[PDB]
């Protein structure tokens, strides 16, 4: 299962 | 028998027209179980292993929604990075991301990871303690300052030590028939005369799983690396792997040479010697 939140660089 | 779950993401910008190409794949140990290709018709996370098909609609809808959110983040990243490195908008660039977790032999969390690359080189990575960041250069340093202030490490640590491990265990059980089974390498040796006085002995290891393996040649009981050749481990295409190691020897002296095969699926290392 993939992570929920993806922070941007 | 430790295990791991990993997700790989690749995004390639296409300045000529449209959005970046985005490809994501998920793996449990050396078995791919999902994928997403922005170029594919479904526009959904898709199964690539039988044991993941058991998951219901909610699973696929959630994974699809999340992977799409990943692509958008990567799309944004490609633009942000172009600026950081002061690059033209005309060239194509690549952002890669990999994250996941390992469970040790005790089936408990062992380690987690979350790393990022730009144009094939380390950019920023979460350290083993899952609390600090490794930034390769000043572009990555700015990202690091931003992620520290937003406490990104804390949020990832929660996923890697919890959710990640929990699902890895769930997948391990559901696909236990293959995921928790080791396929010992099937081995044999071939002989090829390269001249009237020399011959090549090739030691084969076929249809094994996992991919990790070691093939070594010995001459009269001692390791030999000169006059040998070992190819990189390669996928057979049916989920298993292959590898071989060769040595050139004086014709008639084949018996002095032994090939040693170490693999998790073998109670003890195998030793092969030519007929």
């Amino acid at each position: 299962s993939l992570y929920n939140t993806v922070a941007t660089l | 028998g430790s295990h791991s779950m990993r997700y790989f993401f690749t995004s390639v910008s296409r300045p000529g027209r449209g959005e970046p190409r985005f490809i994501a794949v998920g793996y449990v140990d050396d078995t791919q179980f999902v994928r997403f290709d922005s170029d594919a018709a479904s526009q959904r996370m898709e199964p690539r292993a039988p044991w993941i098909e058991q998951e219901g609609p909610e699973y696929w809808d959630g994974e699809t929604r999340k992977v799409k959110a990943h692509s958008q983040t990567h799309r944004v990243d490609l633009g942000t990075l172009r600026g950081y490195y002061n690059q033209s908008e005309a060239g194509s660039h690549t952002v890669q991301r990999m994250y996941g977790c390992d469970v040790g032999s005790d089936w408990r969390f062992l380690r987690g990871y979350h790393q990022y690359a730009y144009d094939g080189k380390d950019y920023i990575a979460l350290k083993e303690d899952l609390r600090s960041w490794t930034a390769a250069d000043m572009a990555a340093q700015t990202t690091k300052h931003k992620w520290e202030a937003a406490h990104v490490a804390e949020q990832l640590r929660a996923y890697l030590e919890g959710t990640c491990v929990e699902w890895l265990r769930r997948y391990l059980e559901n696909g236990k028939e293959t995921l928790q089974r080791t396929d010992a390498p099937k081995t044999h040796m071939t002989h090829h005369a390269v001249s009237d006085h020399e011959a090549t002995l090739r030691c084969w290891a076929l249809s094994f799983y996992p991919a990790e393996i070691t093939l070594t040649w010995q001459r009269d009981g001692e390791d030999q690396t000169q006059d040998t050749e070992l190819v990189e481990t390669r996928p057979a295409g049916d989920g298993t792997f292959q590898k071989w190691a060769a040595v050139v020897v004086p014709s008639g002296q084949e018996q002095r040479y032994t090939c040693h095969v170490q693999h998790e699926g073998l109670p003890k290392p195998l030793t092969l010697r030519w007929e």
């Binding site: - | 690749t10 794949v25 791919q32 690549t94 094939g120 080189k121 090829h192 057979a236």
Partner: protein, 99 residues
């Protein structure tokens, strides 16, 4: 950075004339990911070729397996043709049953 592809051409099962098999072309260690890989039969490109989903190694270099179902014979020659930004001209690796 750029990295040139390593190439391996081989069958999934021991080559046996007249016996159905799979011909593989494994390309790895390259960067960027855009690459052209064709399997050839007597110099001609095979149409029914598929490939695995793009993935990469610890060092970030990419790997892909291109494969096709085929039936080896004594005459037919097989090879993998690879073209990449790092290559001045398309590279060709002939299939050898013993490798």
């Amino acid at each position: 950075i750029q990295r040139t592809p390593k190439i391996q051409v081989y069958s999934r099962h021991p080559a046996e004339n007249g016996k159905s098999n799979f011909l593989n072309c494994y390309v790895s260690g390259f960067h960027p990911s855009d690459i052209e890989v064709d399997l050839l039969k007597n110099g001609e490109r095979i149409e029914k070729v598929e490939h695995s989903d793009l993935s990469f190694s610890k060092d970030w270099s990419f790997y892909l397996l291109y494969y096709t179902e085929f039936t080896p014979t004594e005459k037919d020659e097989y090879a993998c043709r690879v073209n990449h930004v790092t290559l001045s001209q398309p590279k060709i690796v002939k299939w050898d049953r013993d490798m």
